[PDB]
């Protein structure tokens, strides 16, 4: 006679914690900002950001891939 | 006689925590912002952002993929 | 005689928490913003944003894909 | 007999063409951003041409004439 | 017998073409950003041309004329 | 017998072409950023051409003329 018990158990965690997690920002102060501009010429694309206080979080990553395969073959 | 008991168990977690999670911002202050501009020429695309206080969160990521194959073959 | 019991069990979790979750913003203050412009020329597309206080959350991500396959083959 | 046959069938399908001046041009969004002239006096006398922020398209065509002369003669 | 046959069948499919001046050009967003003239006086006299921030397209075509002369003669 | 056959069938498919002046050009976003002239006086007299931040396209074509002369003669 033949008996096969196939009882694998998975309690695993796969976790990503990406970016700005659990931070404390107590009374942050951005200074006064002045941008005085005159007599400028731009021949191509301009990207401009002006400001006193920025919090920027960018997360292209932190993705998870889990692949699992179970094969039982008898004869 | 043959007996097969295929009873795999999965309690697993796959998780993404991506971006700005659980932060405290207490009285954040952006300063005064002045942008004085005169006599400017732009020949191509302009993107402009002006402001005192910004919170920006961008998440292209944090995606999960799970794949799970079960095969039992007898004879 | 042959007996096959096929009883795989899935209690697994796949989760995305993407963007701005569970944050505290206590009395955020944007400053005064002034944008003074005269005698400007733009030959191509302009995108402009002006303001004192921004909260911006953008989530192209945080997607979940789950694939599960069960094959039982006898003879 | 000593017969004579003359067939005079010249054929003209030719083209004479003049394309003179400003033809088939594209002017897409022409013009300056800001033009400013600041004075206490503008004093213009005796054959002055002044252009301030103007757009001018000027075409003069004294030419582009076509002359075609054709002569046919059959003498027996 | 001592006969004569003449078959006079010249063919002209020729083209004479002039393309003279400003043809098929693209002007896409021409013009300066800012032009400023500051004075207390502008004093222009006796054959002055002044251009301040203007755009001019000027085409003069005294030429581009076509002359075609064709002559055919058959004498028997 | 002593007959005579003449077949006169010249064929002209020729092209005579002049392409004279400003043809097929692309002018994409031409113009300066800032032009400033600051004075107390501009004083222009007696055959002055002044250009301040202007764009000029000027095409003169006295030429580009075509002359085609063709003569055909058959004498028996």
From Swiss-Prot, chains A, B, C:
Residue numbers of Phosphoserine PTMs: 1, 20, 48, 52
Site residues (Not glycated), renumbered to this chain: 7, 13, 17, 27, 36, 39, 66, 71
Modified residues (N6,N6-dimethyllysine): 7
Covalent link Glycyl lysine isopeptide (Lys-Gly) (interchain with G-Cter in ubiquitin), residues: 7, 13, 17, 27, 39, 43, 49, 65, 71
Ranges in a coiled coil: none
Disease implicated: In Alzheimer disease, the neuronal cytoskeleton in the brain is progressively disrupted and replaced by tangles of paired helical filaments (PHF) and straight filaments, mainly composed of hyperphosphorylated forms of TAU (PHF-TAU or AD P-TAU). O-GlcNAcylation is greatly reduced in Alzheimer disease brain cerebral cortex leading to an increase in TAU/MAPT phosphorylations.
Comment on protein domains: The tau/MAP repeat binds to tubulin. Type I isoforms contain 3 repeats while type II isoforms contain 4 repeats.
Known partners and oligomeric status: Interacts with MARK1, MARK2, MARK3 and MARK4. Interacts with PSMC2 through SQSTM1. Interacts with SQSTM1 when polyubiquitinated. Interacts with FKBP4. Binds to CSNK1D. Interacts with SGK1. Interacts with PIN1. Interacts with LRRK2. Interacts with LRP1, leading to endocytosis; this interaction is reduced in the presence of LRPAP1/RAP.
Localization: Cytoplasm, Cytosol; Cell membrane; Cytoplasm, Cytoskeleton; Cell projection, Axon
Protein modification: Phosphorylation at serine and threonine residues in S-P or T-P motifs by proline-directed protein kinases (PDPK1, CDK1, CDK5, GSK3, MAPK) (only 2-3 sites per protein in interphase, seven-fold increase in mitosis, and in the form associated with paired helical filaments (PHF-tau)), and at serine residues in K-X-G-S motifs by MAP/microtubule affinity-regulating kinase (MARK1, MARK2, MARK3 or MARK4), causing detachment from microtubules, and their disassembly. Phosphorylation decreases with age.
Residues carrying Omega-N-methylarginine: 45
Protein's UniProt name: Microtubule-associated protein tau
Protein function: Promotes microtubule assembly and stability, and might be involved in the establishment and maintenance of neuronal polarity. The C-terminus binds axonal microtubules while the N-terminus binds neural plasma membrane components, suggesting that tau functions as a linker protein between both. Axonal polarity is predetermined by TAU/MAPT localization (in the neuronal cell) in the domain of the cell body defined by the centrosome. The short isoforms allow plasticity of the cytoskeleton whereas the longer isoforms may preferentially play a role in its stabilization.
Expressed in which tissues: Expressed in neurons. Isoform PNS-tau is expressed in the peripheral nervous system while the others are expressed in the central nervous system.
Known glycosylation sites: 43, 49, 65
Chain positions with N6-acetyllysine modification: 7, 13, 17, 27, 39, 43, 65
Effect of residue 16 to F: In PIDB; markedly reduced ability of tau to promote microtubule assembly
Tau/MAP repeat feature ranges: 2-32, 33-64
